[PDB]
Amino acid sequence: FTRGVYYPDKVFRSSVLHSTQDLFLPFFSNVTWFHD
């Protein structure tokens, strides 16, 4: 779904849209489920 998003850096931003490239979990990606 849309989980796995973390703050890129300790920078305060207010009411702005920021485009940044880094290591992220892709949206709607297939993640492995373990029960082991």
Next chain:
Amino acid sequence: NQKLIANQFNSAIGKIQDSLSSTPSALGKLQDVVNQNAQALNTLVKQLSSNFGAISSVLNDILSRLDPPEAEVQIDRLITGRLQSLQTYVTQQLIRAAEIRASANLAATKMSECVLGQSKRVDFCGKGYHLMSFPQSAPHGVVFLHVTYVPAQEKNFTTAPAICHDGKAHFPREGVFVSNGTHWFVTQRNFYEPQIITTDNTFVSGNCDVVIGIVNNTVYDPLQPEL
């Protein structure tokens, strides 16, 4: 028809107010100009933070970390990049300013011809026969309310270029000959208002043996009934 015209004008200005309140894309030009200016400024600011091949984008960091022999080259690269970015920004600003000046000259001509008087140029002061205009201020712009006259309901009639009465071809002075199928009248060009064919609104030139499509009828001379 004073009352009808007044009511139509009031309804029209109300509709303009409603359209301005509702439609957000009516003022697209001014918003586009402002957005272009903001984009240019933001692009310049972003380019201030570029490297242009330098070891760093921070002048103080280069000065402190790098020795003057290499700091000279790094600063040269940085200033070259910043200078070319500034030149590009100023050139595009000049082009945009030239466009704005052309638009402002057009606006000044429009105010001088459509507001301070009645203009005969078709579609220059709005669609239809231009009547008048009202200027209004706006942030870095001018809005003209052009009030114009538009014919609405047309009807068909039989026409004839001229009328031969007694061998003389009578031509209308200001209007056009029309016929509803039983009688002939003369009406003004842009409005239907039939009038009896008289000698005071028609002039004689030539004879009805030359003009093509002349029709037979009689012309009224009020003097004879007067005497």
Next chain:
Amino acid sequence: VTTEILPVSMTKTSVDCTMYICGDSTECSNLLLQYGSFCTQLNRALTGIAVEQDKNTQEVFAQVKQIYKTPPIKDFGGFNFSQILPDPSKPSKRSPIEDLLFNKVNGLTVLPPLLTDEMIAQYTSALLAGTITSGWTFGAGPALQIPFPMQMAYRFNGIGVTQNVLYENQKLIANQFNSAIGKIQDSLSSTPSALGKLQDVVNQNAQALNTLVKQLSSNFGAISSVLNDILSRLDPPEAEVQIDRLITGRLQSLQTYVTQQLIRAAEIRASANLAATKMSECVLGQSKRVDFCGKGYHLMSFPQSAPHGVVFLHV
């Protein structure tokens, strides 16, 4: 009858900054990334010019909201409009004058215009139909049919000459108009320099593109003009400097090309605005401006399409 030719639009060229500067090289792209958003700005300017081209075309031509078509019977008091009216014989549905006009004229792409030649010809045909059948009424609102003789009488009355001279000299005027349009056709067929403006615009565009392509092959002080040759022959420590020099040269060449394109596009926009004003004032009505709609007392005008241009026949 006089001929006035005005350029309208120009070729919608779009050039990819990255591929033109860097021929699909990872190292070249990595080096280019240090310059910020130059290529984005250049592409934005090119896209703006491309959109402005279609805007100019629509402003010049699309000034009527209905498509009028002439009646099958060509009865106009003796005036013959076959040469200017579109014909069904040619598949393009273009007038013989239009046909004569059309016959006489690496990371970069050409975007086709939004309006094709056929719809431009249809718009011109609608304009001629409106002018012939309704005079200036259709331009100012609803289309009110009016037979041609009284329309010409009105146009004469507009220039201070009474209509009786027209109604007494109809045949002579018709013959003179037919001879004039024949002479215009002959002059267009014979004179090759009549359409110099459009050909000059096309030649300027081609020269700019060819100059850019040639500058792509320059060295700009680099050891070689081939990116692959420099990458293979030179070590990365020196290949970095060589690639930097090459990309600097290519970038400045691209900037110069785009700047001159912007200036030319501004000139074309000014010309198109003048053409739109001319069509609005001389075609959709009778203009009192001296020499604005041709020499002498202007009577009327006929628009015709041409490759990236408009030709006005001022009567």
Next chain:
Amino acid sequence: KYNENGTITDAVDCALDPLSETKCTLKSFTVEKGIYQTSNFRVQPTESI
């Protein structure tokens, strides 16, 4: 999309779909009606001869 309090309320993945690519290239969270140039298709070579 940062809020006024410094927290993020929504995120868009540029490579999710063409609509998301449009959202990224416009740098706006809402896409207006129209057409927007987003990417550049390029066929890549498959063999070396």
Next chain:
Amino acid sequence: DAVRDPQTLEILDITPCSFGGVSVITPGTNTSNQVAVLYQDVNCTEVNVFQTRAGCLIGAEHVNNSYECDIPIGAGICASYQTQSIIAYTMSLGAENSVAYSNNSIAIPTNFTIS
């Protein structure tokens, strides 16, 4: 543009690999999230698929009826969101209106409006 094979005496034409811009045609997100993809000057074989002079259109269904242009694609093609999906069609330059022209008929307005 053309080369000769060193081994076999044959002539071969070299065509640059297909490439071109990729745009997205969609209504406002306030209406729907459905989009269509336009590839400039690329044949559809190299990629609801439609081929036009402007290139290859994917996600839109072409129809025969003509309307006014809403989202200009180019080369005689415009797209619109209609009830619902995205469709592409050739424009109509306006509703046709024949004029009842003759040599003895005139149309005169009898009413007017102030606009």
